[PDB]
Design a protein around this ligand. Structure first.
Ligand SMILES: CCCCCCCC/C=C\CCCCCCCC(=O)O[C@@H](COC(=O)CCCCCCCCCCCCCCC)COP(=O)([O-])OCC[N+](C)(C)C
Ligand SMILES: CCCCCCCC/C=C\CCCCCCCC(=O)O[C@@H](COC(=O)CCCCCCCCCCCCCCC)COP(=O)([O-])OCC[N+](C)(C)C
Ligand SMILES: CCCCCCCC/C=C\CCCCCCCC(=O)O[C@@H](COC(=O)CCCCCCCCCCCCCCC)COP(=O)([O-])OCC[N+](C)(C)C
Ligand SMILES: CCCCCCCC/C=C\CCCCCCCC(=O)O[C@@H](COC(=O)CCCCCCCCCCCCCCC)COP(=O)([O-])OCC[N+](C)(C)C
Ligand SMILES: CCCCCCCC/C=C\CCCCCCCC(=O)O[C@@H](COC(=O)CCCCCCCCCCCCCCC)COP(=O)([O-])OCC[N+](C)(C)C
Ligand SMILES: CCCCCCCC/C=C\CCCCCCCC(=O)O[C@@H](COC(=O)CCCCCCCCCCCCCCC)COP(=O)([O-])OCC[N+](C)(C)C
Ligand SMILES: CCCCCCCC/C=C\CCCCCCCC(=O)O[C@@H](COC(=O)CCCCCCCCCCCCCCC)COP(=O)([O-])OCC[N+](C)(C)C
Ligand SMILES: CCCCCCCC/C=C\CCCCCCCC(=O)O[C@@H](COC(=O)CCCCCCCCCCCCCCC)COP(=O)([O-])OCC[N+](C)(C)C
Ligand SMILES: CCCCCCCC/C=C\CCCCCCCC(=O)O[C@@H](COC(=O)CCCCCCCCCCCCCCC)COP(=O)([O-])OCC[N+](C)(C)C
Ligand SMILES: CCCCCCCC/C=C\CCCCCCCC(=O)O[C@@H](COC(=O)CCCCCCCCCCCCCCC)COP(=O)([O-])OCC[N+](C)(C)C
Ligand SMILES: CC(C)CCC[C@@H](C)[C@H]1CC[C@H]2[C@@H]3CC=C4C[C@@H](O)CC[C@]4(C)[C@H]3CC[C@]12C
Ligand SMILES: CC(C)CCC[C@@H](C)[C@H]1CC[C@H]2[C@@H]3CC=C4C[C@@H](O)CC[C@]4(C)[C@H]3CC[C@]12C
Ligand SMILES: CC(C)CCC[C@@H](C)[C@H]1CC[C@H]2[C@@H]3CC=C4C[C@@H](O)CC[C@]4(C)[C@H]3CC[C@]12C
Ligand SMILES: [Ca+2]
Ligand SMILES: [K+]
Ligand SMILES: [K+]
Ligand SMILES: [K+]
Ligand SMILES: [K+]
Ligand SMILES: [Mg+2]
Lengths: 214, 462, 298, 117, 202
């Protein structure tokens, strides 16, 4: 068939009873779980490597706001309405600038790395709630709550002089729990695979002793 | 060597996630120290293989020498320069080609099928990974005539996925090479990689999964007898045997039937065994093998039945094969009841000289030629008696139809078989004719004979 | 709060706890030697007769299994159109009550096959036992929790593998060609649907390292179509997997699914269409004589 | 040599024809739907089409180009499917056990022949 | 004749390699030759000239540059458009100055583009800085310029976009591959034929 066409012609002691077959299938399973657990550990390790280093390279700092302002420009958010319905609405842009613990110089605040990447030109984005008036109201609400925060309390912040060279975050975007589960359950798979092999060999060898006893 | 090849491949896989060229401190980079040690060990293993080599020039041109020249010197240069380039490091994946050879050295791989499977897997995976690394290098560093401006940011795993899609001929088009060198490489790989995939993937899938379905051994059940059947096993032979053995006109016998044959049953025999799922078991083996005889638990079987090929081309060869089977079964267990079919009478005489062949204990050689010629001779004393005798053995139910035809009467007569059982103390002390006229229609039973042992139609004086 | 892990945990705990209990019973049976026809066989025989179609009740049970496998598959097909996780009232959800009853019947059929089994550990590792551990416990958990996750419910399609066996039990399939055709069709369809369900689960729930943000809204039938396009090697590219796990699954399926398609589709098409062109019989015409010719015809 | 010559000449000629047809559009469309395809781009497209990979990044867009593509798909795939395995079988027919023994000074050697299994 | 021992197999493999390097070098020379042909002719067809600025001005319109921030992060920022017009040595008529062929092709409507540095204010500051440095360059010094009346018919460049060194390496190393391939064949035949003379000598 689709492999070439026409394949170009044709181009190609046993004292234990039946229990032996079930026990050899149990060895197979336990070995396959050992391999699965190790392979999945490496697969998840390669997938988590870049996110985990990009997170580790960002240090904790103490921050204080230098200023809060609007740049007068506006941007599109997308608002949603069931099945696939979406349209766009404007929001006004705030910028916020902040004191920094590693560079001791100006940097622009970005609430989280998704906000930084969805609009790196701007400091905050409202959840899009239909009309422009509600976006502007929600930006003005956040703006007023940030503008009076002057040295009130040095809030902790996250920074990376190598890849966020003048940008600052309020949150870690890397959930430790999700990473923990991604490395724990492959380890559980491996441990269960070892115990299945061990109990199968323990049962198999005790069957011979219980046979020779008779 | 086996472990460190995989270690170096994993190190390359780690590095493939970083930028193409960078500065990194040897005294503070555990992966660069580990790579340094791994390449020291490969330099030593290279030196040993060079010393052991017969023709040096032949060795210098062996491809795992070439793989060391293209992977060991650049590690030394990197460790000296305190910098790394992700250049030809994908050639580390070619180290998997020697895995089968060093498994054969370790006395692990012996069978041709396993050796071929390991060779195919190693060649496929190493080719795939190496080609993926080369296309990753070429795509991430653009064309020199375009001033390296048309580079495509492709990850190593993205290139691996693209190569798999291209090899299988699926060609999604979501990921593809865009540089001129990348496409030029894609064109040459399409010629070789598709022929490799189309050839190796079916052959690997054939090599795997070669499992014996009918393995294992019978498990005896306490309180229930079992029977081992061997010799000429085929769909019609088993179907005819099971119709007579399991007929509803016998009493409630629960004797299990175990078949031993060296040919895997076809789909119609497997369906026949599924229709008898609780009374028939089959196990694939040779009756001449004591291991198989122990598997079918022939040491505890009530008897062993050996069917014969009545329509064979060579009656002498069939008789010889049956004689060998009887010899093997008796050699494994002298005290096993053996029922067998023998085509000729001189071969039956040959067989009865076996030291373990005990006709008193119940060894019956059913000679076909003898019994058929005897039945023909009894038809010369009374015509129809061969039909009369043959119908007394085959188990048959009553069949009745509304038509008044000779067939109705014939079938009514055919419904009777010959049986054997012990008879009441209420009939002890009487004459044989008297108990016959008593049994005939009151009990509805006819007696031909009784247990000076076997007496055919006793006189009135007994 | 989400509960996806409770359904999955109930299946894993069922499969591995049973496997460990069997292996511990074996171990401790032989370890008792350190410190030092029955009714069991009669019930094992009765269960084996019921499992086969040797009695009217056994035939009824086998037909019920055949019908309820398709019923459960259709229930999964209905649910595949809804959101991935949701809250739904058991006392007011006819499909959840029907699924509850279907899984009760499958639990009973599992219990009968366990009693009839010769080697328990061999039975625990038979794949239609595995299909029951991965499909029965999560229905019980859902009916208890008054919530559902569309998790491993695509494994219901693996129930089609036993169709040929239970047709052979019912004395329906006798010829080798028909048996082979049914086997090939069952294996092809079950493999296709199961693989489609798994890729549907993996595409609709994104990568954990990407924080489940790169999920692709793919319907089950869209995934079925994508799998067919991929198996046949057409590769349109209109629909394809985008998540890392989806592509990793696609790579492993391309090795197996193309070899299955390339092997099974020609063989199925050869098995069908084996009709005799020259059948039938001559129809005599009144007033006209006819002559029959035989022997050496060339 | 015959297979290689026929394969390469067929490939290059077909690529040139599809290059001519794609760069000069359809007369009923007044030559306005022409696609600026280079000769090497057409060669790559033909290879992708012959092997049945079908990326879709490059494809014919004119009516004459597609009409040519349809007729080439019938012939070019049968040529590729037949010739590429046969060429790859013809190459690589090397004898693994060739060469000759090299005697070692001070060490004796024994030649064994006949029934070897 | 077969008086040579095992060394014959290594030497025939050495001939193979030397021949493969000869073929590789020639094939790669043709491959690189076809790839460099259009860039090298588009470069050769552009003549050197002496230029002087006629005027420097803004067209009032603005355009997007893209600014970058790690992994894949990018957004866009405006820059104001300057145009610059220049005296020409082949057409002796108006042409528009474009700093290099990539600037000409990324925005042919405009004469310069700033490297995008986040905010619009820094782009406008950097354009005003370049503009002021170009506006007072009136006949100060006839700066050399590159022109092509056949494909840049009223457009002028300050630089060659074709690096001679990159082209030199693209044709040198395939030649080195070919020369090495010849020397390997020659030394292999020289060794093979001297082995026969050293055998016959005994
Ligand atoms: C790279 C992918 C290559 C897959 C190869 C799978 C092994 C195939 C194999 O025959 O291994 C064999 C051994 O092996 C074992 O005892 C453990 C079986 C689980 C191996 C899982 C591999 C993934 C599997 O055993 P088998 O020969 O099937 O014997 C039983 C019949
Ligand atoms: C015989 C067994 C063979 C099989 C395997 C042995 C392989 C030996 C090397 C293992 C890595 C050890 C190591 O230095 O890790 C490094 C992290 O990177 C990791 O920890 C990678 C984790 C993902 C899976 C690998 C340590 O951190 P780093 O110094 O900052 O990392 C430098 C490189 N990097 C920035 C690209 C990550
Ligand atoms: C660590 C690897 C251990 C391999 C063990 C092999 C082995 O035991 O052989 C067995 C499994 O049969 C095979 O070897 C085939 C199954 C696939 C092996 C793939 C190995 C990795 C290949 C690279 C993939 C890329 C990795 C990235 C059978 O071998 P045999 O010749 O039948 O042995 C004699 C039987 N006896 C020992 C029972 C008496
Ligand atoms: C820059 C790009 C570079 C990218 C990719 C380039 C890398 C491609 C790898 C090429 C090697 C592939 C190969 O055929 O290895 C061979 C090793 O040879 C031997 O088997 C004998 C050696 C002892 C094995 O193949 P084979 O054993 O000849 O084939 C089996 C069938 N045969 C027995 C039937 C004929
Ligand atoms: C010992 C066992 C060792 C395990 C070996 C298995 C190793 C497999 C490990 C795969 C790691 C996945 C990478 C994910 C990733 O970084 O995203 C990338 C997409 O990535 C893909 O497109 C995934 C494609 C699947 C590759 C299939 C590999 C199978 C090879 C089987 C043979 C292998 C041997 C894109 O990344 P990004 O976000 O665009 O980049 C910015 C960040
Ligand atoms: C042995 C025979 C085996 C073969 C088949 C038996 C299958 C048994 C289940 C049939 C569905 C019955 C049912 O409750 O329907 C439901 C509607 O959904 C439909 O009516 C679906 C109609 C489309 C075709 C199915 C009733 O409405 P609901 O309670 O609001 O639906 C809840 C689920 N839903 C919201 C996802 C639709
Ligand atoms: C309900 C299903 C009923 C099946 C009836 C089968 C039958 O009668 O067999 C016949 C049709 O031959 C076949 O069985 C092959 C045709 C395809 C059957 C596919 C069944 C569904 C498979 C699952 C697909 C996925 C579903 C989602 C022939 O069988 P036989 O062995 O020749 O019978 C002896 C002949 N006699 C009876 C005429 C004397
Ligand atoms: C008993 C027989 C039972 C019948 C079985 C047949 C069941 C087939 C039923 C298909 C239902 C079609 C779904 C249409 C749909 O919802 O639109 C979707 C696209 O859907 C597609 O892309 C259709 C792809 C064809 C699938 C082919 C199935 C054949 C399997 C044969 C084997 C199956 C066994 C997209 O939907 P949407 O609008 O983007 O989503 C928002 C609303
Ligand atoms: C004696 C040996 C002779 C060597 C023969 C090998 C000759 C091969 C030489 C290829 C030259 C590459 C052209 C590059 C190019 O101009 O860019 C083009 C893309 O080009 C591609 O897409 C490259 C596609 C690979 C073609 C594979 C040829 C193999 C034929 C093997 C058989 C051949 C026999 C696009 O160009 P552009 O920028 O969009 O256009 C404006 C400028
Ligand atoms: C167009 C692509 C076609 C590729 C054909 C390759 C030649 C194949 C061949 O058998 O040539 C042969 C001669 O040849 C030599 O002595 C030099 C070997 C290098 C040739 C490189 C060709 C590219 C290769 O020698 P061989 O017959 O393999 O003899 C040794 C075994
Ligand atoms: C490692 C690189 C840099 C140099 C290699 C060493 C060179 C100079 C020497 C050292 C050992 C030498 C080999 C030793 C033994 C033999 C066997 C003889 O019958 C023919 C010459 C031959 C095959 C020699 C060839 C040249 C040789 C390989
Ligand atoms: C008898 C055996 C097979 C049962 C299988 C184990 C299953 C049923 C067990 C394992 C973990 C358990 C869950 C653990 C946590 C919770 C959350 C709680 O708010 C309700 C109970 C619930 C939801 C449990 C339900 C039962 C559960 C899912
Ligand atoms: C259902 C799950 C959760 C528990 C499994 C029950 C286990 C522990 C018990 C119940 C009955 C037991 C079986 C009873 C009879 C036999 C036959 C003997 O020749 C092998 C052991 C074997 C097969 C026993 C193994 C252990 C066993 C299967
Ligand atoms: Ca009767
Ligand atoms: K294809
Ligand atoms: K395709
Ligand atoms: K395609
Ligand atoms: K495509
Ligand atoms: Mg049984």
């Amino acid at each position: 068939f689709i492999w070439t066409s026409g394949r170009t012609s044709s181009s190609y002691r046993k004292t234990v009873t039946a229990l032996k077959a079930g026990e050899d299938k149990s060895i197979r399973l336990g070995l396959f779980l050992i391999i699965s657990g190790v392979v999945s550990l490496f697969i998840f390790g390669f997938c988590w490597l870049s996110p985990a280093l990009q997170d580790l390279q960002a240090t904790e700092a103490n921050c204080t706001v230098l200023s809060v302002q609007q740049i007068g420009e506006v941007f599109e958010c997308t608002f949603t309405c069931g099945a696939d319905c979406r349209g766009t609405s404007q929001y006004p842009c705030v910028q916020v600038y902040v004191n920094n613990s590693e560079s001791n110089s100006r940097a622009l605040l970005h609430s989280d790395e998704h906000q930084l990447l969805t609009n790196p030109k701007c400091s905050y984005i409202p959840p899009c709630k239909r009309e422009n008036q509600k976006n502007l109201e929600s930006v003005m609400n956040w703006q007023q709550y940030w503008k009076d925060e002057i040295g009130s309390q040095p809030f902790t912040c996250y920074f990376n002089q190598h890849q966020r060279p003048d940008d600052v975050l309020l949150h870690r975007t890397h959930d430790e729990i999700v990473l923990l589960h991604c490395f724990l359950w492959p380890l559980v798979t491996f441990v269960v695979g070892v115990l299945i092999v061990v109990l199968t060999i323990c049962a198999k060898s005790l069957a011979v002793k219980a046979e020779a006893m008779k | 060597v086996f472990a460190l090849s995989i270690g170096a491949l994993v190190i390359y896989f780690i590095d493939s996630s970083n930028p193409i060229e960078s500065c990194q401190n040897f005294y503070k980079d555990f992966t660069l120290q580990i790579d340094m040690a791994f390449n020291v060990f490969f330099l030593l293993y290279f030196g040993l293989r060079f010393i052991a080599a017969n023709d040096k020039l032949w060795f210098w041109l062996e491809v795992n020498s070439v793989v060391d020249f293209f992977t060991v010197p650049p590690v030394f240069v990197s460790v000296y320069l305190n910098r790394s380039w992700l250049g030809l490091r994908f050639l580390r994946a070619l180290r998997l080609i020697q895995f089968s050879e060093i498994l054969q050295f370790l006395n692990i791989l012996k069978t041709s099928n396993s050796i071929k499977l390991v060779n195919l897997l190693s060649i496929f995976i190493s080719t795939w990974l190496t080609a993926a690394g080369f296309i990753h290098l070429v795509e991430n560093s653009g064309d020199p005539w375009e001033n390296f401006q048309n580079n495509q940011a492709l990850t190593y795993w993205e290139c691996v996925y693209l190569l798999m899609v291209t090899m299988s001929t699926v060609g999604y088009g979501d990921v593809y090479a865009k540089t001129t060198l990348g496409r030029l490489f894609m064109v040459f790989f399409i010629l070789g990689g598709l022929a490799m995939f189309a050839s190796y993937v079916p052959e690997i899938i054939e090599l795997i999964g070669n499992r014996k379905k009918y393995g294992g051994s019978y498990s005896a059940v306490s309180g229930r007898k079992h029977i081992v059947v061997c010799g000429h096993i085929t769909l019609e032979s088993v179907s005819n045997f099971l119709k007579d053995f399991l007929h509803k006109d016998r009493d409630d016998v629960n004797v299990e039937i175990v078949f031993l044959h060296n040919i895997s049953p076809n789909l119609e025999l497997e369906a026949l065994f599924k229709r008898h799922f609780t009374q028939v078991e089959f196990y694939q083996g040779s009756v001449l093998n004591p291991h198989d005889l122990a598997r079918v638990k022939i040491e505890s079987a009530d008897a062993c039945l050996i069917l014969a090929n009545k329509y064979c081309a060579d009656p002498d060869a069939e008789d010889a094969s049956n004689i060998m089977r009887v010899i093997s079964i008796k050699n494994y267990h002298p005290k096993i009841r053996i029922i067998t079919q023998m085509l000729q009478y001189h071969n039956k005489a040959h067989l009865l000289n076996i030291p373990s062949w005990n006709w008193k204990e119940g060894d019956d050689a059913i000679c076909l030629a003898e019994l058929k010629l005897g039945f023909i001779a009894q038809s010369c004393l009374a015509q129809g008696l061969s039909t009369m005798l043959a119908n007394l053995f085959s188990m048959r139910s009553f069949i009745k139809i509304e038509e008044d035809t000779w067939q109705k009467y014939y079938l009514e007569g055919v419904s009777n078989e010959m049986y054997t059982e012990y008879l009441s103390s209420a009939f002890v002390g009487l004459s044989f004719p008297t108990v016959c006229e008593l049994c005939f229609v009151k009990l509805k039973l006819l007696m031909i004979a009784i247990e000076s042992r076997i007496l055919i139609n006793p006189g009135n004086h007994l | 709060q989400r509960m996806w892990w409770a359904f999955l945990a109930s299946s894993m705990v069922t499969f591995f706890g049973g496997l460990f209990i069997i292996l511990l019973w074996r171990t401790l049976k032989y370890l008792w030697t350190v410190c030092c026809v029955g009714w069991m066989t009669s019930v094992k025989d009765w269960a084996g007769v019921m499992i086969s179609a040797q009695t009217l009740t056994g035939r009824v049970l086998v037909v019920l299994v055949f019908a309820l496998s398709i019923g459960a598959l259709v229930i999964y097909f209905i649910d595949s159109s809804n959101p991935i996780e949701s809250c739904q009232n058991f006392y007011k959800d006819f499909t959840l009550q029907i699924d509850m009853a279907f899984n009760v019947f499958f639990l009973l059929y599992f219990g009968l096959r366990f009693i009839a089994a010769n080697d328990k550990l061999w039975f625990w590792l038979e794949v239609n036992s595995v299909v029951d551990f991965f499909t029965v416990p999560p229905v019980f958990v859902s009916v208890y929790l008054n919530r559902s996750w569309l998790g491993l419910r695509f494994l219901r399609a693996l129930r089609l593998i036993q169709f040929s066996e239970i047709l052979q039990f019912l004395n329906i399939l006798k010829t080798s060609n028909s048996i082979k055709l049914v086997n090939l069709l069952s294996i092809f369809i079950s493999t296709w649907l199961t693989a489609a369900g798994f890729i549907h689960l993996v595409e609709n729930s994104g990568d954990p390292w990407e924080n489940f943000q790169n999920n692709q809204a793919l319907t089950y039938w869209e995934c079925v179509y994508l799998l067919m396009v991929t198996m046949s090697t057409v590769g349109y590219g209109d629909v394809y997997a985008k998540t890392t796990l989806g592509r990793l699954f696609m790579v492993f399926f391309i090795l197996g699914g193309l070899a299955m398609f390339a092997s099974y589709v020609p063989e199925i098409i050869e098995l069908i269409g084996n009709r005799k062109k020259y059948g039938g019989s001559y129809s005599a015409v009144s007033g006209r004589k006819h002559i029959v010719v035989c022997g050496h015809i060339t």
